[model samples]
Target chain A: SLLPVPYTEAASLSTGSTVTIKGRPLACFLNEPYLQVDFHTEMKEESDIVFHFQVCFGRRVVMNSREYGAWKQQVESKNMPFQDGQEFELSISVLPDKYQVMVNGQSSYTFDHRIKPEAVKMVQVWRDISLTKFNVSYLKR
Target chain B: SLLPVPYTEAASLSTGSTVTIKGRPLACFLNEPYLQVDFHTEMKEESDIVFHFQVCFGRRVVMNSREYGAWKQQVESKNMPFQDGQEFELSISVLPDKYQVMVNGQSSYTFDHRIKPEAVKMVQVWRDISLTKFNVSYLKR
Candidate 1:
């Protein structure tokens, strides 16, 4: 189920150098649950970009996707429904080590780097997305 | 009718001395024929007090119940709808001499002071507000 959390941000920077983006789930269609968000990052240079991010269900995982495969899903629908008249925020954070995504200030997924974390620099929001606010900033040391 | 224009900053400051808070008709509440955003300011000697903010619409102004003989118009509703689902961002830029309020990355308001502008140390979000991202700096340079 897509948690109705909004917004995404970089979560970790001290280690693995990963970036994660997370947000809340949208209204369920056919009572199905899911959440989605996207953003753009500028990789100084182009290279084989590989990273892994997945949605969470407690201590277990529901869906995971790596850079080589684009978006991996747990459910399939022809056209996603739009859930308006609802309130939610989206946040995605990218750090030096790994990528962590959260919705409504909570965890949704973590994308770990597969290739050199140098080629991923852009995120575009698509599918079941409504935004209250979105922001990105480099870690300050 | 709060305009679709990007958030713009206002010009003025009330850091050291008292400045009158005012309001102007906004684009988002065009339906009401007089929907305006009120303005106010407050100072914090410590880091705990919710700094006073003022919003005025015509003759009514709502502050932290501090009597300054300042008439500020207050909104009766917590959901002061703006742009009807459109997103807006509020930012505070603390300069050595004043507090600059930027809306949608546009300078919308400025507050100067009679006291040392450096006396102000913190900024907070008040009213029914949603924040997507924020940036701050304080080097005393």
Candidate 2:
């Protein structure tokens, strides 16, 4: 309720960057609600995506990237660490070769960098969820 | 932005009752956002549904009823009348034998009555849309 869905923030990411989001599914897991986070190479909503992470709560997670406006190799995972009907804490940390995703303090998913993490210019979170908190770490050396 | 997403209004319905809703999908059509309107048997969120109408924008619509907490026979429709990136006005009227759904003043779908219209005690408009107006007509003979 505090933060709007389809939230966008101008961002910069590197190997040490971390993006943390706090939100809850708008509908119960039985409804198969979705939450999507996109790291865009540009601020425009339709721009190329450096990384795309989507979660179909209680069902699946799909990860991919769009290069030159074409979606690249896709990754799908069935590892759901989100509790049904409860708020969730999502953490995504940029690493030297891959992005590590932790859900509720547990490592859950990872995606190797398709484009350099430095190509990230914006982060947009959209889909069927209400966000309470969002932060992109700036304390990287 | 005007009304809550999971907008709920308690009400009654008869043969002449009509429920009108005005809202806009929160995301673009490509994301496949959803909009659900449920005619419930009680005020409780988990109460049995007298009528359930759901639209997967740009894709499909599914209608059903929940009897004694169990979902009944399902009805699916592929008729899409909603415009992408635009606001929509929806009207659902109670007929003697069915509920007729009109999107933007055009009849798009109908569900045969599985439960009497008089059994509806609450109307819930939820899922990924921002509601601006909701009304349950009371001018009936």
Candidate 3:
């Protein structure tokens, strides 16, 4: 079975963790389909969002954060690189200056820190795609 | 030093193995920059290529193989998802039916077995990109 929608997994956002999300777009993805990844500080429903990444198919990617129940100004880019019914690999590497995003086999974008990097304790992925694998690993640097 | 041109490595293409290729397009990538991954059946220079994947910058993706010194017809796709001067993460996962390719964070294509899956022995990456990481890992199936 595919990964359940709105998958939430415990994650460590320490200096060394890298998150890899592998999945595919459903064959019926004709209309707008999007994917969202949220780095949360806690598992609770209202935890502060350390980083929010949203990709709107054929549109743009929006990144932001929420602190104290307030959403910050979004950083949007029209560099979306995905297709319908295609499988993809998205890797997010945590670094000192920003969170580096690599898509497929190319660098896509980066989201600078709006919150403490170490404040990320959980990762929540929810959107309109079939999931294959979600994993986190410690990197050397 | 960085990985030399036409970087080659010993690999085991066993089921459940995933290979991650991370690199960036050279600054002068406008002139026919391309990346090719060949799954060789042996380490020799004349080894059979069981799976050949080539992505030409701003052009198209071509897939084929060579057996007994005979090159097969190319499988071409115009769904290129790469950009110039950008870093990328390309992951290939081996499954029972096919080799799944994920570009960036989206599914791109799949190549079915034309030769015995167990015959794949080495992976050679050649192109106009700066290499950063090449790793192979087996996942729990």
Write model 3 residue lDDT over B53-125, tens digit each, in one string.
8887777898888888777888899887777667888998888888888989778988888887679888887
Give a tens-digit lDDT track for model 2, residues A34-107.
89999998888778888899998989999999888777899999999999999999999999999999999999
iRMSD per prediction, in order:
18.0, 2.3, 18.8
Task: For model 1 chain A, give the 10-residue run with minimal summed lDDT.
Answer: A40-49
Per-residue error at A129 for model 1, in Å? 2.2
Model 2, position B23, has a per-residue lDDT of 96
- Estimated TM-score per prediction? 0.28, 0.88, 0.48
* Candidate 1 lDDT tens digits, B22-126: 223321221111212222233321122212433322223233311243322322323232244345554555455655555455665554433344333333332
Query: How big is the positional error of residue B6 in model 2, measured in Å on the Cα after superposition?
Result: 1.5
DockQ for every model, please. 0.01, 0.37, 0.01
lDDT score of residue A1 within candidate 3 = 27
Error of 1 at B107 (Å): 58
- Cα lDDT listed for each candidate: 0.34, 0.90, 0.76
Candidate 2 has an lDDT of 0.90
When just chain B is superposed on the true chain B, each candidate scores a TM-score of: 0.40, 0.98, 0.91
lDDT pick, better of 2 and 3 = 2
Residue lDDT tens for model 3, A1-141: 268645789877766678999986532232235677889888763587898888766678998888887778989999977766688899998878789889997789898888878888888876555678999896564
Candidate 1 chain B has its poorest 10 consecutive residues by lDDT at B27-36
